[PDB]
Amino acid sequence: LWREKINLLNARLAEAQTSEEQLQSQLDLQKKVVSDCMQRYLQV
Amino acid sequence: LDEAQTIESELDKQLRAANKVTNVLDTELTLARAAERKAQQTAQQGMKEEERELCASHFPVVTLEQLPDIRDLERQHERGIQHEIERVKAELHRLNIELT
Amino acid sequence: LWREKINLLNARLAEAQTSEEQLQSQLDLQKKVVSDCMQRYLQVDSDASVAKAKLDEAQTIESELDKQLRAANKVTNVLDTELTLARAAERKAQQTAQQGMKEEERELCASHFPVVTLEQLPDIRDLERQHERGIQHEIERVKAELHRLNIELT
């Protein structure tokens, strides 16, 4: 049963880490959006 | 620009929360593997099919839900077994007096 | 033992939260510095280029501080979970400890049962089982002696 719990927790932890990576990427993209806004302000 | 800076913070906080979730799942997985090896060190001993059949006829099958409570069932069976041991031993002592 | 552990974990969690909040304040101040350099890039090897370089440095430091705050958040969450587990165990210990004793009983227990240490605190149940096994051996030998005496007396 511990091996079965390991099987389940493997998928759960993998999905949690994937969500963490996605959130990190989206945070980087939001900082990139800040960069885009600053560039547009620089142009004007 | 200010709007984007404001939006950044919520994603940062959600990334921290995802870190927490990942760490909790990793801790549970690591402890599950530790308990797995702990039980396997005993599971290595095995049984002969007659012994396993007797155990099944006397012991319930542990379920994943029952995994945290396994010791309760094991101790309950042990204590019932000890009760039976003392009872039959007392009856044997009674018959010993009879034979004497 | 669990109450000592809970007080120590309260102190530890407070310190970890203080460190995480200090890093949060530093990260917010670094984002403010990023904003300052970003705005000076516009309100001003030219002055604009120097402000742009300052902004790059500020953003790098902001990323560094965010990555440090992540570790601090990890520490805070781990310590909070440990405190929760300590409280959960302490409530059970209190429930079982609340049954009380009389000083004769306490003398008997101490003379044969130890004062468990904090480091052994989670493992206390198995030590209790070992002492139970000792008492069980004494019982299961004395009873046999009674059996023998009964036989002879008959």
Side-chain angles (χ1 to χ4, degrees):
Chain A
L1 291 166
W2 283 124
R3 290 182 181 248
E4 182 169 343
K5 192 78 174 187
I6 286 157
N7 299 341
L8 181 56
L9 278 163
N10 294 342
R12 294 283 72 73
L13 176 61
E15 180 155 39
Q17 286 177 343
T18 305
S19 185
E20 176 189 321
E21 287 165 24
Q22 283 170 345
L23 278 160
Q24 168 56 32
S25 183
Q26 291 152 10
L27 176 62
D28 284 332
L29 173 58
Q30 188 54 219
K31 296 177 186 186
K32 196 175 181 180
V33 168
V34 176
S35 188
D36 294 343
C37 299
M38 81 156 68
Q39 283 165 17
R40 184 180 174 82
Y41 192 99
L42 280 151
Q43 282 180 354
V44 303
Chain B
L1 182 77
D2 288 353
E3 173 178 329
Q5 284 276 58
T6 304
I7 295 157
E8 182 270 354
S9 181
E10 180 57 21
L11 291 167
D12 185 352
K13 281 176 275 149
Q14 286 181 19
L15 179 54
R16 302 165 202 190
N19 296 342
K20 178 181 172 183
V21 173
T22 287
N23 297 340
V24 166
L25 288 164
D26 173 27
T27 302
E28 293 309 319
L29 179 57
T30 303
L31 292 165
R33 287 159 180 175
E36 190 284 328
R37 64 160 160 52
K38 182 173 182 172
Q40 203 277 350
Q41 288 152 18
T42 302
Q44 284 170 33
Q45 297 153 19
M47 301 195 188
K48 298 176 185 176
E49 182 57 16
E50 314 98 311
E51 313 168 324
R52 190 177 295 94
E53 286 169 344
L54 183 70
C55 289
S57 54
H58 195 198
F59 309 140
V61 63
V62 186
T63 76
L64 187 62
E65 306 83 9
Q66 296 160 359
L67 190 53
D69 303 342
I70 190 174
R71 287 181 182 76
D72 304 340
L73 316 174
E74 190 191 327
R75 286 180 313 97
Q76 288 146 13
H77 281 295
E78 185 192 323
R79 288 161 175 204
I81 284 159
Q82 181 63 87
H83 173 276
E84 293 320 302
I85 283 165
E86 65 169 36
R87 184 266 303 185
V88 302
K89 182 63 67 65
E91 186 53 32
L92 183 140
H93 163 46
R94 177 74 262 174
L95 289 182
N96 205 312
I97 290 278
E98 175 65 45
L99 288 152
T100 307
Chain C
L1 293 165
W2 276 118
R3 284 159 188 247
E4 169 175 16
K5 191 76 168 183
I6 277 162
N7 303 337
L8 179 53
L9 277 163
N10 292 342
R12 287 175 172 198
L13 179 60
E15 173 52 26
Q17 286 169 323
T18 304
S19 189
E20 186 199 316
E21 288 148 17
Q22 284 162 345
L23 292 172
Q24 170 69 37
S25 178
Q26 292 157 17
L27 178 59
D28 291 334
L29 179 60
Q30 191 59 221
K31 288 172 186 182
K32 189 180 179 179
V33 168
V34 163
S35 193
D36 283 339
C37 298
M38 182 179 72
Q39 287 181 2
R40 182 171 179 80
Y41 189 11
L42 296 161
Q43 291 168 358
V44 298
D45 59 353
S46 63
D47 295 349
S49 307
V50 171
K52 188 190 180 183
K54 289 180 173 183
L55 175 58
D56 294 339
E57 173 174 310
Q59 287 185 342
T60 305
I61 301 161
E62 186 282 312
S63 185
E64 176 61 26
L65 279 166
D66 183 358
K67 284 183 175 181
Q68 293 182 14
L69 178 57
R70 288 166 202 202
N73 271 260
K74 170 182 174 186
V75 170
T76 290
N77 299 330
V78 165
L79 284 165
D80 183 19
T81 309
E82 294 315 314
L83 178 57
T84 304
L85 293 164
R87 287 168 178 183
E90 192 279 328
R91 274 183 269 104
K92 177 166 174 177
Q94 168 192 33
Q95 290 151 11
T96 314
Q98 277 162 330
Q99 297 164 14
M101 293 180 183
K102 289 185 180 180
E103 183 53 21
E104 308 177 326
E105 314 172 311
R106 201 167 294 96
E107 295 157 24
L108 174 59
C109 286
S111 51
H112 308 78
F113 311 148
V115 172
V116 181
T117 67
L118 195 75
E119 63 267 17
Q120 294 152 319
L121 179 53
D123 292 331
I124 190 165
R125 291 175 179 85
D126 279 334
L127 314 180
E128 191 190 308
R129 283 206 293 158
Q130 294 147 18
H131 280 269
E132 176 280 336
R133 282 165 186 138
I135 304 161
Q136 169 53 34
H137 173 276
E138 289 317 307
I139 282 179
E140 78 204 357
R141 195 264 305 175
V142 172
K143 188 65 65 66
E145 187 57 16
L146 271 293
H147 177 172
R148 182 187 72 81
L149 288 195
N150 179 1
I151 288 284
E152 175 164 20
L153 192 151
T154 58

